[PDB]
Scaffold this active site. Structure first.
Site, short mmCIF file in Angstrom:
data_model
loop_
_atom_site.label_atom_id
_atom_site.label_comp_id
_atom_site.label_asym_id
_atom_site.label_seq_id
_atom_site.Cartn_x
_atom_site.Cartn_y
_atom_site.Cartn_z
N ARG A 1 4.47 2.33 15.11
CA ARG A 1 4.10 2.09 13.72
C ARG A 1 4.12 0.60 13.40
N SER B 1 11.51 4.53 -15.52
CA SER B 1 10.43 5.35 -16.06
C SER B 1 10.61 6.81 -15.68
N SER B 2 10.90 7.06 -14.41
CA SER B 2 11.04 8.42 -13.91
C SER B 2 12.23 9.13 -14.54
N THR C 1 9.03 27.52 2.11
CA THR C 1 7.66 27.03 2.07
C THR C 1 6.70 28.06 2.67
N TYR D 1 9.85 15.58 -2.14
CA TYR D 1 9.74 16.89 -2.77
C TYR D 1 9.47 16.78 -4.26
N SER E 1 -0.71 27.19 -7.64
CA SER E 1 -0.45 28.53 -8.18
C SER E 1 -1.34 28.84 -9.38
N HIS F 1 0.81 -1.20 0.00
CA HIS F 1 0.00 0.00 0.00
C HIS F 1 0.85 1.26 0.00
N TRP G 1 7.78 -0.12 2.99
CA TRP G 1 8.15 0.49 1.71
C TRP G 1 9.62 0.88 1.65
N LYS H 1 6.20 30.72 0.12
CA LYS H 1 5.25 30.30 -0.90
C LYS H 1 3.81 30.38 -0.41
N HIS I 1 17.64 12.96 8.63
CA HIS I 1 16.67 13.13 9.70
C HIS I 1 15.74 11.93 9.82
N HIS I 2 15.85 10.97 8.90
CA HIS I 2 15.21 9.68 9.02
C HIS I 2 16.05 8.68 9.80
N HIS J 1 14.54 11.45 0.63
CA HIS J 1 14.08 12.80 0.96
C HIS J 1 13.91 13.70 -0.27
N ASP K 1 5.35 19.66 -29.79
CA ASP K 1 5.35 18.31 -29.23
C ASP K 1 6.50 18.22 -28.23
N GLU L 1 12.67 12.42 -2.86
CA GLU L 1 11.48 11.80 -3.43
C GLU L 1 10.20 12.49 -2.96
C1 HEA Z 1 0.36 9.15 -1.53
C2 HEA Z 1 0.53 8.64 -0.33
C3 HEA Z 1 -0.57 8.08 0.50
C4 HEA Z 1 -2.03 8.26 0.47
C5 HEA Z 1 -2.92 9.09 -0.43
C6 HEA Z 1 -2.43 7.41 1.61
C7 HEA Z 1 -3.85 7.26 1.98
C8 HEA Z 1 -4.40 6.61 3.18
N1 HEA Z 1 -3.63 5.91 4.03
FE1 HEA Z 1 -1.56 5.51 3.94
N2 HEA Z 1 0.52 5.18 3.82
C9 HEA Z 1 1.41 5.75 2.99
C10 HEA Z 1 1.03 6.74 1.98
C11 HEA Z 1 -0.33 7.18 1.63
N3 HEA Z 1 -1.43 6.79 2.28
C12 HEA Z 1 2.82 5.34 3.15
C13 HEA Z 1 4.03 5.78 2.38
C14 HEA Z 1 2.76 4.37 4.24
C15 HEA Z 1 3.90 3.60 4.87
C16 HEA Z 1 3.81 2.10 4.65
C17 HEA Z 1 4.97 1.46 5.37
O1 HEA Z 1 5.27 1.86 6.50
O2 HEA Z 1 5.58 0.55 4.78
C18 HEA Z 1 1.31 4.37 4.56
C19 HEA Z 1 0.73 3.54 5.60
C20 HEA Z 1 -0.57 3.82 6.19
C21 HEA Z 1 -0.83 3.63 7.63
C22 HEA Z 1 0.14 3.20 8.69
C23 HEA Z 1 0.05 1.68 8.75
C24 HEA Z 1 0.98 1.14 9.79
O3 HEA Z 1 1.87 1.87 10.24
O4 HEA Z 1 0.80 -0.03 10.17
C25 HEA Z 1 -2.25 3.95 7.77
C26 HEA Z 1 -2.95 3.93 9.07
O5 HEA Z 1 -4.10 4.30 9.19
C27 HEA Z 1 -2.76 4.33 6.43
C28 HEA Z 1 -4.14 4.69 6.11
C29 HEA Z 1 -4.52 5.52 4.97
C30 HEA Z 1 -5.91 5.95 4.79
C31 HEA Z 1 -7.10 5.65 5.66
C32 HEA Z 1 -5.85 6.70 3.53
C33 HEA Z 1 -6.99 7.39 2.87
O6 HEA Z 1 -6.63 8.72 2.50
C34 HEA Z 1 -7.49 6.58 1.68
C35 HEA Z 1 -7.07 7.14 0.32
C36 HEA Z 1 -8.08 8.13 -0.20
C37 HEA Z 1 -7.78 8.99 -1.18
C38 HEA Z 1 -8.80 9.96 -1.67
C39 HEA Z 1 -6.42 8.98 -1.83
C40 HEA Z 1 -6.53 8.24 -3.16
C41 HEA Z 1 -6.28 9.22 -4.28
C42 HEA Z 1 -6.91 9.17 -5.46
C43 HEA Z 1 -7.93 8.11 -5.76
C44 HEA Z 1 -6.56 10.23 -6.48
C45 HEA Z 1 -6.26 9.65 -7.85
C46 HEA Z 1 -7.29 10.18 -8.82
C47 HEA Z 1 -6.98 10.56 -10.07
C48 HEA Z 1 -5.58 10.48 -10.59
C49 HEA Z 1 -8.06 11.08 -10.96
N4 HEA Z 1 -1.74 4.17 5.38
C1 HEA Z 2 4.59 15.21 0.61
C2 HEA Z 2 5.67 14.69 1.15
C3 HEA Z 2 6.41 15.34 2.25
C4 HEA Z 2 6.75 16.75 2.46
C5 HEA Z 2 6.46 17.98 1.63
C6 HEA Z 2 7.48 16.68 3.74
C7 HEA Z 2 8.02 17.90 4.35
C8 HEA Z 2 8.80 18.03 5.59
N1 HEA Z 2 9.08 16.97 6.38
FE1 HEA Z 2 8.56 14.94 6.10
N2 HEA Z 2 8.08 12.92 5.73
C9 HEA Z 2 7.41 12.38 4.69
C10 HEA Z 2 6.87 13.20 3.60
C11 HEA Z 2 6.99 14.65 3.42
N3 HEA Z 2 7.62 15.45 4.29
C12 HEA Z 2 7.25 10.91 4.69
C13 HEA Z 2 6.56 10.02 3.68
C14 HEA Z 2 7.91 10.54 5.94
C15 HEA Z 2 8.10 9.19 6.58
C16 HEA Z 2 9.09 8.36 5.79
C17 HEA Z 2 8.91 6.96 6.26
O1 HEA Z 2 8.07 6.25 5.67
O2 HEA Z 2 9.61 6.56 7.22
C18 HEA Z 2 8.37 11.83 6.47
C19 HEA Z 2 9.09 11.92 7.74
C20 HEA Z 2 9.79 13.12 8.18
C21 HEA Z 2 10.94 13.06 9.10
C22 HEA Z 2 11.60 11.84 9.67
C23 HEA Z 2 11.09 11.69 11.10
C24 HEA Z 2 10.84 10.24 11.44
O3 HEA Z 2 10.23 9.53 10.61
O4 HEA Z 2 11.25 9.82 12.53
C25 HEA Z 2 11.28 14.47 9.32
C26 HEA Z 2 12.41 14.92 10.17
O5 HEA Z 2 12.93 16.01 10.01
C27 HEA Z 2 10.34 15.28 8.51
C28 HEA Z 2 10.31 16.74 8.49
C29 HEA Z 2 9.79 17.52 7.37
C30 HEA Z 2 10.00 18.98 7.29
C31 HEA Z 2 10.74 19.87 8.25
C32 HEA Z 2 9.31 19.34 6.05
C33 HEA Z 2 9.20 20.70 5.47
O6 HEA Z 2 9.43 20.68 4.06
C34 HEA Z 2 7.84 21.33 5.76
C35 HEA Z 2 7.98 22.84 5.83
C36 HEA Z 2 6.63 23.52 5.92
C37 HEA Z 2 6.26 24.22 7.01
C38 HEA Z 2 7.18 24.33 8.19
C39 HEA Z 2 4.91 24.88 7.05
C40 HEA Z 2 4.87 26.16 6.22
C41 HEA Z 2 5.74 27.24 6.82
C42 HEA Z 2 5.24 28.34 7.41
C43 HEA Z 2 3.76 28.55 7.52
C44 HEA Z 2 6.18 29.37 7.97
C45 HEA Z 2 6.14 29.37 9.49
C46 HEA Z 2 6.98 28.25 10.04
C47 HEA Z 2 7.91 28.46 10.99
C48 HEA Z 2 8.15 29.83 11.55
C49 HEA Z 2 8.72 27.31 11.51
N4 HEA Z 2 9.31 14.47 7.87
CU LIG Z 3 12.36 13.75 5.01
#
Ligand code: HEA
Ligand code: HEA
Ligand SMILES: [Cu+2]
Ligand SMILES: CCCCCCCCCCCCCCCCCC(=O)O[C@@H](COC(=O)CCCCCCCCCCCCCCC)COP(=O)(O)OC[C@H](O)CO
Ligand SMILES: CCCCCCCCCCCCCCCCCCCC(=O)O[C@H](COC(=O)CCCCCCCCCCCCCC)COP(=O)(O)OCCN
Ligand SMILES: CCCCCCCCCCCCCCCCCC(=O)OC[C@H](COP(=O)(O)O)OC(=O)CCCCCCCCCCCCCCCCC
Ligand SMILES: [Mg+2]
Lengths: 153, 504, 141, 86, 72, 114, 266, 47, 91, 90, 104, 78
Positions: B432, B153-154, B310, B239, B250, B60, B125, B313, B284-285, B235, B90, B237
């Site tokens: 988790r 692909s990417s 951010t 972004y 935008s 998932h 994952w 933005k 930070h992971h 990380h 194109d 990925e």
């Molecule tokens: C894109 C990233 C994404 C999205 C959308 C979701 C969506 C949801 N996820 Fe999850 N989830 C992950 C990324 C995501 N997740 C990741 C990375 C893990 C880690 C697995 C691991 O640890 O190995 C995780 C694991 C994870 C956990 C933790 C499991 C665990 O630790 O044991 C849970 C717990 O509740 C959860 C629940 C849900 C639920 C209820 C939704 C709901 O939002 C259901 C989805 C509903 C939607 C609306 C989104 C679907 C989007 C579309 C259908 C748009 C596409 C349409 C067009 C292109 C036209 N998922």
């Molecule tokens: C859409 C994907 C996405 C994005 C955009 C981000 C954005 C950020 N993430 Fe995250 N992150 C994940 C997806 C993402 N992350 C996933 C999937 C995991 C778990 C991986 C796994 O499966 O293990 C993860 C886990 C993760 C960790 C690892 C922690 C852990 O798992 O133990 C950390 C640690 O630093 C982190 C921090 C941040 C920070 C600082 C940003 C910043 O970019 C966000 C900055 C934005 C703001 C701060 C808000 C806007 C700012 C303002 C309004 C200004 C005012 C703010 C201040 C004055 C502070 N996230």
């Molecule tokens: Cu990160």
């Protein structure tokens, strides 16, 4: 013979330096009656309880706890044997991964007695949910006078 | 024949969008099992099978990260919209654009086929060794080969995008007049090219450990090196998956506010600063793996600097809505909902960036709540904002407005009441990747499982929004895709449009 | 010590380090509350006061140097104010400035924990000089 | 008679933003946010005050047993004193 | 003829409706004309239903497959 | 009778030893089973080595295990420093690691000089 | 067909200098060939019967589709479909592909640097491990360095020359010097006193040098395919320049590989 | 007057390279995919 | 004779015969600096190849000959490995 | 015309003209079809771009405020200026 | 910027422009989101009722009453029992556990 | 591509700081205690203890006075 023993006691009465030297000899002889160092050693396993009673917590309760003294600087060496595990006790602020081949050290000192719970916090298989951690904290005088006497051979 | 042999970017983008919808359906279905097992303490519908639960969460997570968001934003909207937006007739390499798509159904088939082989790939994952090495059989190899094909692909798509931007621009149009969607897609392509091959190298090392008895991550090797390489990929990925969402937000915000974007050069410098800082904060992971305190010190101090661009933005989006003439439709709500709910996910990242605080909440559901805020409110809202905005241009069908607001409100209710209690679970210490928990965690898990059903019902209602479209004649616009008819011809921009600077 | 039903924040603590971590988290949440409230209120006011029923035609506002510099230099100060206590908490994780009193080897297996120890227990006469004087006055008479 | 481009924007200052009051709303938002933040920090300081009082009471208790332990040690010393003098 | 380099390079000069199309997608004004497919809304709903059924039923089959293997 | 003005140093030392022992056997015991109220227990573990500053402490384990056998080769078997090294590695190294290291030493697969 | 060229001139060629392709079947076949070869590779890892045969069957299908695709690209390059801007697009695409491959090599050499500098307790903290005899720098690797530098200079000759005989001779010299690099690497692989299962030294050495040698082979095949097109018409266009750039990239990669593994003992 | 039989890009070779391979390889990949699916699913690993 | 490449040819001028030969000589100086000597030593190396022998057996250290899985996908010994050198007796 | 230095030779100039389109003297935009999309910038802001559609046989048309007027003319060949008239260099 | 909005409004005639923030009337939205929440609750109830294979014995009412009698008390095997979480339940620092309390 | 706005230099100051910190961190690792490929490095106990204590003190000695003062928070929570 016997008066020379009494003359030695008279020299103890008279000379302060001889009195101090024989006091030091008394201190040397009293340290000889002190028991020698003994090793404390154990190796036990801690398993989750499958069935709990009231007063015990499901999933988090074990059969064998880790007993640690309070107000003492404790080194925790964390490692693993097969896969990655993480030793997490949220009440004590310690969460460090157990890596096979590494020896990660934690310095820890506990403020108060109690029973602290934890789980493993790194995915490690089908039964990742069922590796809980329980730490029992007791006072240092109890630890050094009663608990460590359970591990003297 | 048409959909099998295509060289047009508009057919390939639509194929990416349909594929991403299929992947979203699969990950919605895999996520109702996660929430239906976790609803009550004890053993649910999985009958206490923990390996099957690990397989379900691994598949998932991989599916929703790589076969839903990237094929919708980067492959779906980018391929359809980039040549029309910059005026290119194109793509630069039209047949490379077709193999960039057609390596995705093989990777999805390999990933779905690894679940039916042996006991499946229950690793997460991230697929950490030695748990990934210890798995005996074929499933893990099929999963890693699926990741390899998706990475190829990417990389091919990013090469085609980067050459299409640099060399097929309209006459007179410099790197100042392209919309922010184009700038976001170009920066995403640069990130893909710099980041994906490190993952490919780490996965080749994983196969040589599994099957060739080599010494990369093993008894005599170093297992921290895998986490270094994987998160150096991973990380960037996250972004890669959020920058096209910024571009779509935008374009949507600027459209219905009847205003241009506030601070265009600041927006571009902020996206560039986000792209550059994403390559020096990967560890930070890895706060709990036993790194030295100086390394943890640097990776703590450098992660929080990502907050500043951010925030710039977000504040510029608010300034774009400010002093405009705003009309609120369904894409405008998905953008307002994006800006509101991405901020909630971003501020928890600042908390997680601090290492001492991260010692308490690492591998808890706090992290899960953080990344489901920044991905289900950040990328899914950005995807659905573009579906209602450009949908009559891309598909030739309009949408009923009332049912789309019903779908938006059902989704907004469902995903907020799903991941907000997971903050309280993660603060209390619920870990988790577990299917059974302590007895006291029952209430918020029941609330979150109630919310997931609302999210599923919202997914169901979305199929009812489509209806017949009305077609009119365009005269003027601020971007090139709104002076075209709906739908455009097969060769859109029959004559190449030019940009004329005003004289004196 | 153990989690509780309907719990919102962390568990109670038994080390000074865990308390310091929770204190740092609450210090960060201080700033996060203000940031989120500012964003939500300003967006509500902008949504309500610039609807098309209230506006005849929009204004041309593209840039504003003062406001852009203000929202770039304000969050940087918040980041550098948060960081120095966080850096100080990181460098305090090593507490080897005392005599260590116990070593415990923790081994993680599939699926259980194993605890080990091998130290030495030695005994020392508690305040021997009083016994030294007691023996001195026992021998002098 | 050609086709003209219509006027599309007001200049910033005489449109529907003179009556907005940006700085007033910023001050209102900052006052509300700082009020909620100081309420949160007030609760935190209250909880820390209780923890400090808890540990002070625990030290008060723990000082009591260790005085009675040394008192019993001095009693055994006073017994061993007359044990070697009788 | 029919295999010359010009057939490879400039394609085949087909004009009009291709085989079963009701509209010219290659040279007409719209590359997608969903109002000219006969019985379009039946086919669209059947295809969307099939996509929903497969996308929601593949993980259920994978759960049933893995649990039927243990129960033997 | 040899008085204190005529006794030598060694006879006086023996008389001092007799005088001390004949009373401390009454005070503490001949074996020392009477000092249990006047004894303070203390636990001895491996000290902090400045040479090993990181959180991973496997090298400290390995170097102490090797310094033990170097001490055993050079300075005899019953030297106090060798016992210090032995208690130092026993305090740090897991038992599985140590038993793997003696089976590698017994098989001949130890790369140390000694 | 006769009006298809007329239609292309009237609607695409006379309006912009960019090339528009007719529909093609090779990307779909290449994708499903990757699927078949991945199933075969998974079966071949775990010693299933008829698994290596399936993997070779899939790889042969991929290679055949790639050759047919590249023949179509060369046919379109010989009917004059590619203007100068299209050729510059080809050079920019090769630059992007080269950057991707360079990051792959950086990830590969990261592991070598990490494993070599801090030997673990599992290796009894000695690098290189006892029993492993390292390959020196004062021997056949230095001959490879001289040969591959000569190949760099000979490919640099062919880029600036205008006489067709000199260009063909320089291309043949660089191809022949590349083939001498591989046949000498085969001798290193056979005479070496360690295998791929002998320590992380052997693992890192063989994986890194195998990827570099496979890139040497692919660059030599690319230069060979560029020479035969120059042999027929005395005009290569983007095929010559992109291949010379790729060969220079391989020569640059060898510098890092040699300096890290052979000199640095990592 | 610019093509020889030795030439790889001869127009007389276009049927074999482009039309025959498009169906031969199209059926070979179907046959290989079905066998590979059955082999990985219903096969036993000996290593 | 009406190709696209010829149609757009006057709009893409070549950037401006003996200077080419001067550049060829300049690059051939560096070619002949390292060209013949490397070929000569490689042709010497092709004739001093698999004739020498090593009889240094290696003790079976835990980091030598890793067999986490039984054998290799092709056979028992390593690929390209004519003569294994690690002791299989140990003694 | 404007200075043709630093201009690509295939850009079809008229976009490089020295004339401001007025109502009485517009800029004639050549076209190969009966309609053509062009792009005009805002005279007070270079970053703002407006795309419009010109039709054949229509009155002069302005796209941005205080901008040029434009008339489409249907032609068979559009001068690819950079080698069409500066090679003539009349 | 105005003409593209007016073009979008012509191609989306079901989108209202009636001069209010929520253009679709709430009399259309509220019953349908209520029906969706009702269907979600039906699914959630069906999972809670018919899809459980093991309900643990620590959630039965007899266990709950016997646990409520004890409270948040943890036993120890080397020491008297201790109150769990002494800050959120406001146990004073002089009291460590129930048996050591010995109420006056 | 454009004129760098007055924001972008205020962005570039901590970005330059983070890049310099990253470079210094990567550079100081091959001048650390456990990056030695020999066992004979540790048999000189004076030099090894000096090197490892120098590896401890740098970038931590800036924080010793506030570690001793418990300046672990922005506010002062007792
Ligand atoms: C894109 C990233 C994404 C999205 C959308 C979701 C969506 C949801 N996820 Fe999850 N989830 C992950 C990324 C995501 N997740 C990741 C990375 C893990 C880690 C697995 C691991 O640890 O190995 C995780 C694991 C994870 C956990 C933790 C499991 C665990 O630790 O044991 C849970 C717990 O509740 C959860 C629940 C849900 C639920 C209820 C939704 C709901 O939002 C259901 C989805 C509903 C939607 C609306 C989104 C679907 C989007 C579309 C259908 C748009 C596409 C349409 C067009 C292109 C036209 N998922
Ligand atoms: C859409 C994907 C996405 C994005 C955009 C981000 C954005 C950020 N993430 Fe995250 N992150 C994940 C997806 C993402 N992350 C996933 C999937 C995991 C778990 C991986 C796994 O499966 O293990 C993860 C886990 C993760 C960790 C690892 C922690 C852990 O798992 O133990 C950390 C640690 O630093 C982190 C921090 C941040 C920070 C600082 C940003 C910043 O970019 C966000 C900055 C934005 C703001 C701060 C808000 C806007 C700012 C303002 C309004 C200004 C005012 C703010 C201040 C004055 C502070 N996230
Ligand atoms: Cu990160
Ligand atoms: C098997 C896949 C082979 C793909 C070949 C390829 O990538 O080459 C393309 C160009 O590729 C590049 O630009 C370089 C990248 C090469 C990627 C090679 C894939 C290797 C995978 C590992 C050719 O472009 P096109 O097929 O769209 O035709 C363009 C036409 O001739 C004129 O427009
Ligand atoms: C999709 C991603 C790719 C996944 C497939 C990777 C499979 C790797 C197969 C390796 C098989 C050869 C390994 C091997 O032992 O051969 C070595 C050649 O190195 C090499 O050629 C190793 C590099 C392989 C790159 C492919 C030398 O053999 P040896 O070390 O046993 O010889 C020493 C005796 N003198
Ligand atoms: C490593 C693989 C690298 C493959 C690079 C292919 C580039 C394709 C290209 O430039 O197409 C336009 C290019 C046209 O160039 P032109 O000759 O200037 O028209 O198409 C080709 O036919 C390029 C030559 C392909 C040679 C086969 C590849 C051999 C690689 C080793 C196997
Ligand atoms: Mg973890």
């Amino acid at each position: 013979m016997s008066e020379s023993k009494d003359q030695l006691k008279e020299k103890l009465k008279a000379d302060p330096s001889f009195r101090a030297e024989l006091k030091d000899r008394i201190k040397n002889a009293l340290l000889s009656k002190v028991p020698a160092s003994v090793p404390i050693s154990y190796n036990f396993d801690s398993y989750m309880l499958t069935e709990v009673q009231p007063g015990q917590l499901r999933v988090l309760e074990v059969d064998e706890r880790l007993v640690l003294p309070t107000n003492t600087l404790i080194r925790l060496l964390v490692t693993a044997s097969d896969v990655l595990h993480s030793w997490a006790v949220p009440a004590l602020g310690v969460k460090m991964d157990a890596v096979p081949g590494r020896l990660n050290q934690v310095w820890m000192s506990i403020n108060r007695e109690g029973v602290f719970y934890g789980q493993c916090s790194e995915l490690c298989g089908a039964n990742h949910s069922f590796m809980p951690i329980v730490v029992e904290a007791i006072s240092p005088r109890q630890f050094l006078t009663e608990y460590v006497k359970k591990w003297i051979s | 024949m048409r959909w099998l042999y295509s060289t047009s970017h508009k057919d390939i983008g639509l194929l990416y969008l349909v594929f991403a919808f299929f992947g979203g359906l699969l990950g919605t279905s895999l996520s109702m099992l996660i929430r239906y097992e976790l609803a009550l303490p004890g053993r649910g519908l999985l009958d206490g099978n923990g390996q099957l639960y690990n397989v379900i969460i691994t598949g998932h997570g991989i599916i929703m990260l790589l076969f839903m968001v990237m094929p919708a934003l980067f492959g779906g909207f980018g391929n359809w919209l980039l040549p029309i937006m910059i005026g290119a007739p194109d793509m630069a390499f039209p047949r490379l654009n077709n193999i960039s798509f057609w390596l995705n159904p093989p990777a999805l088939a390999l990933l779905l086929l690894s679940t039916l082989v042996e006991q499946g790939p229950g690793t997460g994952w991230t697929a950490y060794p030695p748990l990934s090495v210890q798995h005996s059989g074929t499933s893990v190899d099929l999963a890693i080969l699926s990741l390899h094909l998706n990475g190829l692909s990417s990389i091919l798509g990013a090469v085609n995008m980067l050459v299409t931007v640099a060399g097929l621009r309209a006459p007179g149009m410099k790197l100042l007049h392209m919309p922010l969607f184009v700038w976001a897609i170009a920066l995403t392509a640069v990130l893909v090219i710099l980041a994906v091959p490190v993952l490919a190298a780490a996965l080749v090392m994983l196969l040589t450990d599994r099957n060739i008895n080599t010494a990369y991550f093993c008894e005599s090797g170093d297992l921290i090196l895998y986490q270094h390489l994987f998160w150096f990929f991973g990380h960037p990925e996250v972004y890669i998956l959020i920058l096209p969402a910024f571009g779509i937000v935008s374009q949507v915000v600027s459209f219905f506010s009847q205003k241009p974007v506030f601070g265009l050069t600041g927006m571009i410098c902020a996206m560039g600063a986000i792209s550059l800082l994403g390559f020096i904060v990967w560890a930070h992971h890895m706060f709990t793996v036993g790194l030295d305190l100086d390394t943890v010190a640097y990776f703590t101090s450098a992660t929080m600097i990502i907050a500043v661009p951010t925030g710039m933005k977000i504040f510029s989006w608010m300034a774009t809505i400010y002093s405009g003439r705003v009309w609120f439709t369904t894409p405008m709500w998905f953008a307002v909902g994006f800006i509101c709910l991405f901020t909630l996910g971003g501020v928890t990242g600042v908390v997680l960036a601090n290492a001492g605080v991260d010692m308490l909440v690492h591998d808890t559901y706090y992290v899960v709540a953080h990344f489901h805020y920044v991905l289900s409110m950040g990328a899914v809202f950005g995807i659905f904002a573009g579906v209602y905005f450009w949908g009559n241009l891309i598909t030739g069908l309009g949408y009923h407005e009332g049912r789309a607001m019903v779908h938006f409100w059902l989704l907004f209710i469902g995903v907020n009441l799903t991941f907000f209690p997971q903050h309280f679970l993660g603060l209390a210490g619920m870990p988790r990747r577990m299917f059974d928990y302590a007895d006291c965690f029952a209430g918020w898990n029941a609330v979150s499982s109630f919310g997931a059903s609302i999210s599923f019902i919202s997914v169901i209602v979305f199929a009812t929004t489509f209806q017949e479209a009305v077609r009119t004649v365009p005269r003027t616009a601020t971007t090139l895709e709104w002076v075209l008819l709906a739908t455009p011809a097969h060769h859109a921009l029959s004559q190449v449009p030019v940009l004329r600077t005003a004289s004196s | 010590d153990s989690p509780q039903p309907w719990q919102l924040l962390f568990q109670d603590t038994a080390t000074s380090t865990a308390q310091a971590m929770i204190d740092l988290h609450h210090d960060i949440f201080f700033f996060l509350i203000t940031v989120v409230t500012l964003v939500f209120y300003m967006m509500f006011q902008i949504i309500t006061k610039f609807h098309y029923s209230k506006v005849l035609k929009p204004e041309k506002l593209t840039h504003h140097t003062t406001m852009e510099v203000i929202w770039t230099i304000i969050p940087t100060l918040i980041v550098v104010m948060i960081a120095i206590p966080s850096l100080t908490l990181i460098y305090s994780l090593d507490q080897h400035t005392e005599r260590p009193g116990l070593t415990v080897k923790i081994i993680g297996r599939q699926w259980y924990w194993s605890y080990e120890m091998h130290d030495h227990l030695q005994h020392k006469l508690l305040d021997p000089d009083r016994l030294v004087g007691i023996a001195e006055k026992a021998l002098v008479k | 008679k050609a086709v003209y481009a219509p006027s599309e924007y007001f200049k910033y200052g005489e449109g529907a933003s003179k009556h907005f009051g940006f700085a007033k709303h910023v001050a209102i938002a900052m006052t509300v946010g700082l009020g909620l933040s100081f309420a949160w920090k007030t609760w935190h300081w209250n909880e820390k005050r209780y923890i400090a009082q808890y540990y002070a009471d625990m030290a008060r208790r723990e000082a009591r047993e260790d005085a009675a332990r040394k008192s019993a040690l001095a009693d055994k010393y006073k017994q061993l004193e007359e044990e070697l003098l009788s | 003829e029919k295999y010359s380099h010009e057939e490879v390079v400039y394609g085949d000069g087909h004009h009009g409706l291709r085989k079963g199309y009701t509209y010219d997608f290659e040279h007409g004004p719209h590359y997608l004309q969903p109002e000219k497919i006969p019985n379009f809304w039946s086919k669209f709903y059947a295809g969307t239903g099939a996509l929903y059924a497969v996308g929601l039923g593949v993980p259920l089959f994978a759960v049933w497959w893995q649990q039927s293997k243990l129960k033997a | 009778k040899p008085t204190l003005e005529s006794l030598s140093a060694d006879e006086l030392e023996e008389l001092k030893n007799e005088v001390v022992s004949e009373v401390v056997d009454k005070i503490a015991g001949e074996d020392g089973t009477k000092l249990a109220d006047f004894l303070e227990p203390e636990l001895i573990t491996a000290p902090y080595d400045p040479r090993f500053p990181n959180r991973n402490q496997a090298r400290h384990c390995f170097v102490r295990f090797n310094e033990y056998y170097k001490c055993l080769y050079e300075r005899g078997e019953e030297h106090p420093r060798c016992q210090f090294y032995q208690k130092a590695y026993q305090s740090l190294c897991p038992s599985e690691w140590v038993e793997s290291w003696q089976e590698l030493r017994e098989k001949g697969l130890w790369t140390g000089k000694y | 067909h006769q009006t298809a060229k007329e239609f292309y001139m009237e609607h695409i060629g006379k309006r912009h200098p960019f090339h528009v392709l007719p529909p093609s079947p090779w990307p779909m076949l290449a994708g499903w060939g990757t699927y078949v070869s991945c199933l075969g590779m998974a079966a071949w890892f775990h010693n299933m019967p008829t698994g290596g045969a399936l993997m070779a069957f899939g790889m042969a299908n991929i290679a055949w589709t790639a050759i047919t695709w590249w023949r179509d690209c060369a046919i379109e390059g010989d009917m004059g479909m590619h203007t100068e801007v299209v050729r510059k697009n080809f050079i920019s695409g090769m630059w992007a592909f080269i950057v991707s491959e360079a990051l792959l090599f950086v990830g590969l050499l990261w592991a070598c640097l990490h494993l070599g500098m801090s030997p673990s307790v599992a290796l009894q903290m000695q690098w290189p491990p006892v029993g492993i005899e390292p390959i020196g720098w004062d021997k056949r690797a230095l001959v490879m360095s001289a040969v591959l530098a000569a190949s760099y200079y000979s490919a640099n000759v062919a880029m600036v020359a205008k006489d067709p005989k000199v260009v063909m001779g320089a291309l043949a010299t660089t191809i022949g010097l590349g083939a001498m690099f591989l046949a000498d690497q085969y001798l290193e692989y056979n005479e070496t006193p360690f295998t791929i299962t002998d320590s992380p030294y052997g693992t890192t050495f063989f994986v890194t040098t195998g990827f570099h040698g496979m890139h040497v082979l692919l660059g030599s095949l690319y230069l060979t395919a560029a020479l035969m097109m120059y042999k027929r018409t005395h005009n290569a266009g983007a095929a010559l320049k992109s291949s010379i750039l790729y060969w220079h990239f391989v020569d640059i990669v060898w510098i890092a590989v040699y300096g890290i593994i052979y000199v640095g003992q990592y | 007057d610019s093509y020889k039989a030795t030439d790889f890009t001869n127009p007389k070779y276009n049927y074999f390279f482009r039309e025959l391979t498009a169906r031969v390889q199209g059926v070979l990949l179907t046959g290989g995919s079905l066998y590979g699916t059955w082999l990985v699913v219903f096969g036993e690993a000996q290593r | 004779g009406e190709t696209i490449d010829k149609y757009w040819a006057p709009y893409f001028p070549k950037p401006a015969a003996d200077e080419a030969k001067k550049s060829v000589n300049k690059e051939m100086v560096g070619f002949m600096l390292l060209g013949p000597v490397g070929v000569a030593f490689m042709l010497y190396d092709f004739a001093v190849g698999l004739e020498e022998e090593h009889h240094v057996t290696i003790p079976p250290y835990p980091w030598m000959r890793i067999r986490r899985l039984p054998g290799m996908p092709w056979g028992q010994d390593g690929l390209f490995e004519g003569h294994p050198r690690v002791a299989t007796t140990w003694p | 015309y404007r200075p043709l230095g630093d201009k690509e030779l295939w850009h079809e100039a008229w976009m490089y003209e020295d004339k401001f389109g007025t109502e009485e003297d517009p800029i004639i935009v050549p076209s190969l079809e009966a309609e053509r999309i062009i792009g005009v910038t805002d005279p007070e802001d270079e970053t703002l771009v407006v795309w419009g559609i010109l039709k054949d046989g229509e009155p002069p048309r302005q796209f941005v405020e205080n901008g040029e007027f434009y008339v489409l003319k249907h032609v068979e060949y559009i001068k690819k200026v950079g080698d069409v008239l500066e090679a003539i260099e009349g | 910027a105005r003409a593209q909005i007016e073009r979008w409004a012509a191609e989306h005639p079901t989108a209202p422009r009636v001069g209010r923030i929520f253009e679709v009337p709430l009399g259309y939205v509220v019953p349908r989101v209520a029906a969706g929440i009702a269907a979600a609750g039906c699914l959630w109830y069906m999972n809670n009722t018919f899809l459980q294979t093991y309900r643990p014995e620590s959630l039965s009412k007899e266990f709950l009453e016997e646990q409520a009698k004890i409270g948040e008390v943890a036993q120890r095997m080397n020491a008297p029992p201790v109150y769990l979480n002494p800050f959120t339940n406001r146990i004073p620092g002089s009291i460590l556990g129930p048996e050591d309390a010995k109420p006056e | 591509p454009f004129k760098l706005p007055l924001d972008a230099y205020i962005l570039m100051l901590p970005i330059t700081y983070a890049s310099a910190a990253f470079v210094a961190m990567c550079c100081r690792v091959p001048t650390a205690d456990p990056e030695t490929s020999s066992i004979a490095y540790y048999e000189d106990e004076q030099k090894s203890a000096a090197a490892a204590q120098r590896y401890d003190n740098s970038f931590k000695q800036f924080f010793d006075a506030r570690i001793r003062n418990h300046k672990v928070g922005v506010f002062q929570n007792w």
